[PDB]
C-alpha cells in the first residue's frame, strides 16, 4: 500500500557512498572552463582553516529591512602561507579522458616537498629528487616545446609551506592547479616566470571574489541512522531500540535498497561548498591586518589566547564569509568559480567595520591583552 502521509526522503542520494574521503587534502574535481580571451592565471589555492571570528559589515541591499544598518556575520579564517610552484604538468585530451604527456620540475625542490614522497623521512637517506634535480636544461626545454605543441591543458604542481604555520606536520601538501588563460604558449611562459618562486593569495584572488571551498568534513566515526540522516526517533515504547529505521524496505524487492538510511561513517567526507565570499585578504607584512577604517587600532587577526586548537596566524590569510567544511587545522582548497558570476551578491563590495579578536576560549570581554591589562590595573 501507499505510504499514508507523503514526506521527502531523508538523506541526499547525491552524496552517496557516505564513506571516508581517501585523503585530508580535498581534491578539486574540476577546474573552471577555459576562456582563452583572458590573461593566464591560477584557479586554485590551498590554505589551512584556523578558526572563525565574527565581523561587522555595513549592508548595501536597497530594499532590505537590513539596508543601511551594520550587521554581524560569521567568517572563517584560512591561513594562506604562499604556495610554492614546483612543476608544470601537460595534459592532452583523448577519447579516454585527459592523459599526461610529462611533468617538468624546478631545479630546486624544497625539503618539505620531498617529505611528501616519504612515509619515514627520519629513517630515509632522502634520495628523492636527487637525480632529477641534476638533469640538463635542454631536456626540460624540449619537454616544454612538446607541451606547447600538443597539450591542451596546463597544471602547476604547487605545494604548501606548512613549516610556516603552527601545524605539526613538516610534510608539504602537493596539489595540481589548472592554469586558465589565452594561448598554451602564453600559459607556459607564465609558468616559467613563476616556476621556483612563490604564489601569495593576492596573485590568485581579490577582495569580494566569490570562491568555492573544497575540504574534507569533520569526522564522527560510525554514527547512527538518526544522526547520519536525520531519521525520526521511534517512540519510547519501542522494544529493541528507538534510534533506528523501523522498516528498511518492502518485502518485494527482496533486497535492502541503496536508498535506505543505515548506521555507518559520518563526517570526513569530501565536500565542495560554493559561493563563499572573500571579505578580506590579509598580509603577513601588516600589523594592522584585523584593523579597519572604523576600528583604527593595531590588531593582528589572531584572537587573544590564539585560535583555539590551531595556533597563531602570522601569515597572509583569507577572511571568507560564513563557514567551511572540516576542522581547525584542515587543508582547504579555494577555487575560482566555474562560471563568472554577475549576481549582485558576487559584485557587492564589502567594507568591514569591525573584526572580533576576543578570546575564543571562553566568553572573551576584550580585544587585546593591553585593553584587559588597562581594565584590570596593577595586581598580584
Amino acid at each position: 500500500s501507499h505510504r499514508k502521509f507523503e514526506r521527502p526522503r531523508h538523506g541526499s542520494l547525491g552524496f552517496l557512498p557516505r564513506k571516508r574521503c581517501k585523503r585530508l587534502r580535498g581534491k578539486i574535481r574540476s577546474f573552471p572552463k577555459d576562456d582563452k580571451e583572458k590573461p593566464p592565471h591560477f584557479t586554485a589555492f590551498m590554505g589551512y582553516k584556523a578558526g572563525m571570528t565574527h565581523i561587522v559589515r555595513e549592508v548595501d541591499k536597497p530594499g532590505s529591512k537590513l539596508h543601511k544598518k551594520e550587521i554581524v556575520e560569521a567568517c572563517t579564517i584560512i591561513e594562506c602561507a604562499p604556495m610554492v610552484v614546483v612543476g608544470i604538468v601537460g595534459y592532452r585530451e583523448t577519447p579516454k579522458g585527459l592523459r599526461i604527456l610529462s611533468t617538468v620540475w624546478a631545479n630546486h625542490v624544497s625539503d618539505e616537498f620531498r617529505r611528501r614522497y616519504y612515509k619515514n623521512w627520519y629513517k630515509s637517506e632522502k634520495k628523492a629528487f636527487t637525480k632529477s634535480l641534476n638533469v640538463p636544461e635542454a631536456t626540460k626545454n624540449c619537454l616544454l616545446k612538446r607541451i606547447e605543441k600538443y597539450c591542451t591543458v596546463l597544471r602547476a604542481i604547487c605545494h604548501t609551506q606548512p613549516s610556516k604555520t603552527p601545524l605539526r606536520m613538516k610534510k608539504a601538501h602537493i596539489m595540481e592547479v589548472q592554469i586558465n588563460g589565452g594561448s598554451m604558449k602564453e600559459k607556459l611562459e607564465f609558468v616559467k616566470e613563476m616556476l621556483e618562486k612563490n604564489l601569495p593569495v593576492s596573485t590568485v584572488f581579490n577582495p569580494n571574489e566569490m570562491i568555492d571551498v573544497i575540504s574534507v568534513t569533520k569526522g564522527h566515526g560510525t554514527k547512527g541512522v538518526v544522526s547520519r540522516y536525520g531519521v525520526k526517533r521511534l517512540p519510547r515504547k519501542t522494544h529493541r531500540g528507538l534510534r533506528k529505521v523501523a522498516c528498511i524496505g518492502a518485502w518485494h524487492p527482496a533486497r535492502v535498497q541503496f536508498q535506505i538510511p543505515r548506521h555507518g561513517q559520518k563526517g570526513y567526507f569530501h565536500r565542495t561548498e560554493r559561493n563563499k565570499k572573500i571579505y578580506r585578504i590579509g598580509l603577513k607584512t601588516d600589523k594592522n591586518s584585523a584593523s579597519t577604517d572604523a576600528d583604527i587600532t593595531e590588531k593582528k587577526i589572531t584572537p587573544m589566547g590564539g585560535f583555539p586548537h590551531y595556533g597563531v596566524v602570522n601569515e597572509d590569510f583569507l577572511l571568507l564569509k560564513g563557514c567551511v567544511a572540516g576542522t581547525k587545522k584542515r587543508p582547504i582548497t579555494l577555487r575560482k568559480n566555474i562560471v563568472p558570476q554577475v549576481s549582485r551578491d558576487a559584485l557587492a563590495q564589502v567594507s568591514l567595520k569591525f573584526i572580533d579578536t576576543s578570546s575564543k576560549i571562553g566568553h572573551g570581554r576584550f580585544q587585546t591583552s593591553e585593553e584587559k591589562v588597562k581594565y584590570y590595573g596593577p595586581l598580584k
Partner: protein
C-alpha cells in the same frame, strides 16, 4: 505595505497559550494555526514575532470566546538574533488580536512590542508605547 520580515527564531508552536497584550477584553490566546506555514510531516506549526496566528481566547470577554480569531505576536521569550549580533528576548509570549487585514480589534497595547513587529504592521506601531 511590506511583508519583508527577516527570519526570527520560530518557537511558539500550536497549542501555546500567550498573553493577550491588548485592550480587547481577552486575557489569553491559545494559538491554533500559523498563517503562511506550509507542510512538514510531523512539524508543529510555530509562530514568531511578525507572524499572524489564528487563536481562540481561553479566558476573557464571552464575546471573544468560542471563536477562531486572528492575532499577531508582539513579544516572545525564545531569544532571537537581532542582526546587530545581539539576541533579544522578552519575559513573556504575547500577541494582539486583529482582523485578517491586520486591523486591531482592540485600541491600545499594554506592554512593549518588538521593532520587528512594528516594521511589519503600521497600525500596530500606532498603538504601541515602548517599541523595542
Amino acid at each position: 505595505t511590506l511583508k519583508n520580515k527577516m527570519r526570527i527564531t520560530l518557537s511558539l508552536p500550536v497549542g501555546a497559550l500567550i498573553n493577550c497584550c491588548d485592550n480587547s477584553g481577552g486575557k489569553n490566546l491559545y494559538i491554533i494555526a500559523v498563517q503562511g506555514f506550509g507542510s512538514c510531516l510531523n512539524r508543529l506549526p510555530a509562530a514568531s514575532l511578525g507572524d499572524m496566528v489564528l487563536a481562540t481566547v481561553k479566558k476573557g470577554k464571552p464575546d471573544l470566546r468560542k471563536k477562531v480569531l486572528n492575532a499577531i505576536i508582539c513579544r516572545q521569550s525564545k531569544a532571537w538574533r537581532r542582526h546587530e549580533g545581539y539576541y533579544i528576548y522578552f519575559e513573556d509570549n504575547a500577541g494582539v488580536i486583529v482582523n485578517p487585514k491586520g486591523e486591531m480589534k482592540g485600541s491600545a497595547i499594554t506592554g512593549p512590542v518588538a521593532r520587528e513587529c512594528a516594521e511589519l504592521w503600521p497600525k500596530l506601531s500606532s498603538a504601541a508605547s515602548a517599541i523595542v
